[PDB]
Amino acid sequence: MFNNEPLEQIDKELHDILADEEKRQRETINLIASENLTNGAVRECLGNRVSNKYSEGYPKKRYYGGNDFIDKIEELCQKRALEAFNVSDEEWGVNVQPLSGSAANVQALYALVGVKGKIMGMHLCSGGHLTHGFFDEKKKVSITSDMFESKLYKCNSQGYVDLDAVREMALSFKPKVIICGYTSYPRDIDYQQFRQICDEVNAYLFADISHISSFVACNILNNPFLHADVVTTTTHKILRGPRSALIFFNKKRNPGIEQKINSAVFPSFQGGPHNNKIAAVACQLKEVHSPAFKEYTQQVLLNSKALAKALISKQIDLVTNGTDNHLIVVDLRKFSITGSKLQETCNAINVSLNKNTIPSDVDCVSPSGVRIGTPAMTTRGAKEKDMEFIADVLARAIKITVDLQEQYGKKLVDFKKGLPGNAQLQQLKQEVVTWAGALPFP
Amino acid sequence: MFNNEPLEQIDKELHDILADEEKRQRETINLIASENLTNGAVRECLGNRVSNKYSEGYPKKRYYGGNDFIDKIEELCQKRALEAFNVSDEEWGVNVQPLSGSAANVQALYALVGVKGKIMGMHLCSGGHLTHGFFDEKKKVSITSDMFESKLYKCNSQGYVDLDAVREMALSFKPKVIICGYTSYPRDIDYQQFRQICDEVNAYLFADISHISSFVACNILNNPFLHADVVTTTTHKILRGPRSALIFFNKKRNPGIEQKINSAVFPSFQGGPHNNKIAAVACQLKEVHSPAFKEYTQQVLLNSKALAKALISKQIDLVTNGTDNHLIVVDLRKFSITGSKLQETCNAINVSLNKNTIPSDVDCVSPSGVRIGTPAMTTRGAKEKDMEFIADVLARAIKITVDLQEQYGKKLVDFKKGLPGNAQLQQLKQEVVTWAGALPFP
């Protein structure tokens, strides 16, 4: 008693937009640092009937019948997660049920500190996440600043984490958790240094490695598992998995953390797991552990180094003057333009990026930077040689932006008036589409 | 620079379990009240590349470029959501980003009351959800009992919502929110009555209709939208959508609630939306509004009435002695067995259900009932005549459970010893598989 017609026949309106979205994807230079493109295997999992199952609880301890195969799927995922990060299942445990990074982080923090608990995070303007305790004067923007008491450490004027400031703050504030690992931080992390600071104030060490997860797995960047109590990561970014998250806990450093973390995920916060996610994560995790994915990850950094190099060669300023990973933040101050305007210009030419703050910024709405990343284009087979081209495309977008600000003015509404029908933008978009459309598309 | 081998070739281990799960689903009599089976169209959406996109914020108000088609999909979902529940976009608004029912509820509650805020909900043992403020004497089981201050109302010994008790509690406790609409409540709800109590005490009216959403939409049961400030519902249950949730808010009753709810979903709790979810919800909502889905929803109740009738004819006791909806709770006390045991026995025969508490219950690990539901089997084309068979199968499982308890004992571990190889169970499972395996399967 159901309709079985395929999507095209059953919902032609929706299918058209999705075909449109697909085309836009195929024809964009995607520089969103947090984006990637999943393979068919991961999407076959997301589309699977395994999402039919209600399976509240944990494997072997469900609140429903019919969970025999779901248990195998949940355990294989946990297995592959611990494998992927080269941690012994004896020392480290993992929860594979958080629906997304924001959820995982809120869950993990509560497990560690509870309501009104004290937490320390990097500020949003400095590269930190919303879920790292963010608030402004006016409002408690994230729940992490409301259900928890938070204080926020800023990076220095150069854009690097100031460990001195971190220690200064920890000794006065006395938090139960300190969060490191970031959303738009272009440099590696001194985890050991964080560990020594946490030890001084009897605080937990929280490493959110969502952006840099593939580097950690493939042993290309610092390994937070050597020092961290809790490691979170999303699966949809550099890891190239589906949209989901993982919570890792050091059982050996903290006995009874397993129960604490697991009870926080369920039944404190979530209900039924999304088993299609868990299946998809499992699939990607197998791939994460291969020598071939290590190659992909290496190429991500090769590409990011080259892109930084080529942008510098064109007189563009970068926060920290380079990168240790997949991501770059461009400081646009010398051009007297905003990230907001550069975002609109880049969208008009099919270049995906986002506006981003820099250390000197005081404005969340009008930032002085854009953030770019290589994981998506690296997935699409782009190499170091291709980076000069992206660098050139961005330079030209910056120039065009300066011109349009000259013609139409500083107001964002006024500025957008110049984008449609602009001859150079049309020429640039076509230039973008031609190269982007030809690249391998999973 | 990726792998494009299909799931079968890329990950054979995982593909086998999924095919195993698919086989089990096809050959199970699914009586889990919160379960359904999605069509291929909904699964093509969950599998779509649209999940590649990061689109934090709201349509037209994104924090990333290249969201032109993502905006159309998020808007068409809001459009179809309000359409399906027969509400005007001028009076009612909706958020389509909550990832699941538990998140949406925590999100919606925070919006209304904030941290330390006061809320009222039905007790878990009485039929209410975890996210309705549930706590134990020992522990604050749900975050809804911890980040909020909660009180819990119990149904009477007959299993009906006791409005006297609700009012008595509301006048003393003075909550800011009162929650109605439930997880395992077999009767319709007097929303008007709740509204009168909420008015008296200046409390918001919260109706969580996840279990009964299709009834509300198709105007087969009481409409909470006539009276409620906030309406939440998951999409994966009787709605037969993907795993996601919706928050509805009455703008006419509460100006400024839109910003409150929207900011609570993001950036208070979540980060990037799951666009494949939104696409899938949109697709199912078109179907919800059709006269053909009204037919399906009618069948669900016709089947649930019949099944209740047939169980009573076999001397099985029901909570409230019947049903107003898709769900029944069987009181097993007269048989001196637990739901836990009946759940294992039913799993052994390919009958999916869950153990459920009853009003006299004081125990959560071992309850005195099972909960059953018709949405899945109705989806599979089963009619009123088919219900006698399901009733017969359950009666037979109950008997086998009494026998096995006599032989092996009251300990759950001891009891399970008797399940494998049992000739009657093998006979019953085969009877189950034959009939279920031949039913239409989306």
Ligand SMILES: COCc1ccc(-c2cc(C#N)cc([C@@]3(C(C)C)C(C#N)=C(N)Oc4n[nH]c(C)c43)c2)s1
């Ligand atoms: C309405 O509350 C104030 C805000 C919520 C999110 C804000 C935000 C603004 C900007 C800018 N420009 C950038 C961000 C960024 C980037 C990555 C997009 C951002 C930056 N820069 C950082 N550090 O973390 C984030 N988490 N989520 C989002 C959307 C961000 C966040 S401002």
Ligand SMILES: COCc1ccc(-c2cc(C#N)cc([C@@]3(C(C)C)C(C#N)=C(N)Oc4n[nH]c(C)c43)c2)s1
């Ligand atoms: C951590 O200990 C406290 C608990 C968490 C879940 C508990 C629970 C036990 C039983 C039993 N028997 C039943 C439930 C039910 C049913 C639908 C399965 C349940 C019941 N009965 C109700 N009312 O709501 C629920 N939300 N989530 C779950 C799993 C439930 C929940 S008790």
Ligand SMILES: Cc1ncc(COP(=O)(O)O)c(CNCC(=O)O)c1O
């Ligand atoms: C470090 C970090 N942690 C958690 C999250 C949250 O994940 P969800 O959005 O899946 O909830 C993000 C999102 N990052 C925003 C970006 O870099 O584009 C992040 O950068």
Ligand SMILES: Cc1ncc(COP(=O)(O)O)c(CNCC(=O)O)c1O
């Ligand atoms: C009334 C109600 N509200 C919210 C939820 C939460 O949904 P998620 O599991 O998607 O977070 C449930 C789950 N229902 C459990 C059951 O009836 O089987 C529910 O029954």
Ligand SMILES: [Cl-]
């Ligand atoms: Cl999903």
